[PDB]
Amino acid sequence: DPTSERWFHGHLSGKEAEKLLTEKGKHGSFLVRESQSHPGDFVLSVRTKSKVTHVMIRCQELKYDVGGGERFDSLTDLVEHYKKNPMVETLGTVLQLKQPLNTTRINAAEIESRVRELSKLAEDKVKQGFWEEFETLQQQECKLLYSRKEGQRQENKNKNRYKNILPFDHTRVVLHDGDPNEPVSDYINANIIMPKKSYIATQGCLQNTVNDFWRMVFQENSRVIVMTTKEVERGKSKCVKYWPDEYALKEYGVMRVRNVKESAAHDYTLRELKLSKVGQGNTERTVWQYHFRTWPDHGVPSDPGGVLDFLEEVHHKQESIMDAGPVVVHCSAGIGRTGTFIVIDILIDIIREKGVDCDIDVPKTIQMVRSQRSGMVQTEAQYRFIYMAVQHYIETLQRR
């Protein structure tokens, strides 16, 4: 632990660093690494005909220098030196050290250190570190423009709650058996999310898509639904009730749904729904609806403790059913709260398998999720909550 700054990536291979600079960085981006060839020493990787240069740094008696010149007492002073006194590469390219490439990989057991550092003001020091990580993603969202022609069709205009929140065509959920009396019948504002596990992120049902929604649940073999919104939030409707009252039977087109039993918790309510198709016998599936009804709209839940307990119940219910389809998650647009909960669940699965000493990367996981649905995780508050969720989960595993 020579420095605390995030431009120190620790153990990172030279070959691997050439990718992070070429993809997540611009001209003049730099980063320091642990030397793979010479233990104890370090490497300074700078991007610049986009090239990556590897400047090797020596560590003699805790003194740093690049082969020759004045020797520094700390590695952070060395970086500041060659930022105002640039070096010249052998290919005539001057190494302009403009912006650092802050790291995003963190050892799960060492997450508290990253949260405590992201809370410091990041350099002129107008916002915290969480803000800079969150804008690094919103900036890299431009290199993420896939086609969305199916969502923009005239036939599907009334099937989308928001005109500019549409599903990608290469991950869209395509409905097969539909109604020939419809210009288009295979479209629902939803996407399949894959890191074993897969999720379905969809919008809150409109009045004219309740029937389509259940045609997706039945088609996809889904047995668990996670609703993360109330029916109404401050006068505005965020999701029409697509399930029937308890002990009631409602028919949604070719589909049949019965609310057998409900279980109430302070943060959520569990509804046991039996889903069948009209006229077809022994097609009845039990769909579990977990309705989280204490999540504010653009805010975050009160404590990560209630969300993680809720989160674990979804996990156990999924594995208790044999060969259950993807888990259907939806808020109102299926973007902010939906992504936050999916992003958390993906990370917890990484921890369930590898343990507390694994490498987590929340931006890399969010960006990997955003390539499958537009702009998952909406606000910065939700972004900080993901860390606060993992940290609270790591702490519980460390006790006992």
Residue numbers in the entry: 106 to 153, 164 to 238, 241 to 312, 324 to 528
What does the paper say about this structure?
The full-length, wild-type SHP2 (FL-WT) contains three domains: a protein tyrosine phosphatase domain (PTP) and two preceding Src homology 2 domains (N-SH2 and C-SH2). The binding of a phosphotyrosine peptide to the opposing face of the N-SH2 domain exposes the catalytic cleft to substrate and activates the system. In diseases caused by SHP2, mutations are often observed at the N-SH2/PTP interface (e.g., E76D/E76K), resulting in constitutively active protein and abnormal cellular proliferation. The recently developed inhibitor, SHP099, allosterically closes the protein and deactivates SHP2 by stabilizing the N-SH2/PTP interaction.
Therefore, we used a truncated SHP2 lacking the N-SH2 domain (ΔN-SH2; residues 104–529). As a single point mutation at the N-SH2/PTP interface (E76K) results in opening, we predicted that the ∆N-SH2 would resemble the completely open structure, albeit crystallizable. In agreement with our expectation, cross peaks in the [1H-15N]-TROSY-HSQC spectrum of ΔN-SH2 are nearly superimposable with the corresponding SHP2-E76K peaks, assuring that the ∆N-SH2 construct mimics the full-length, open conformation. We then crystallized and solved the ∆N-SH2 structure at 2.9 Å. Remarkably, each structure shows an approximate 120° rotation of the C-SH2 and PTP domain with respect to the auto-inhibited structure. The hinge motion of the C-SH2 domain is achieved by changes in the main-chain torsion angles of residues L216, N217, and T218 in the linker region. A rotation, and not a detachment, of the C-SH2 domain results in a distinct C-SH2/PTP interface, which is stabilized by several electrostatic interactions within the C-SH2/PTP interdomain linker. However, in our four ΔN-SH2 molecules we observe both states. The WPD loop (chains B and C) is displaced 10 Å from the surface of the protein to the out conformation, and overlays perfectly with FL-WT structure. In addition, the N-SH2 is far removed from the binding pocket in the open structure and reorientation of the C-SH2 completely disrupts the binding pocket.
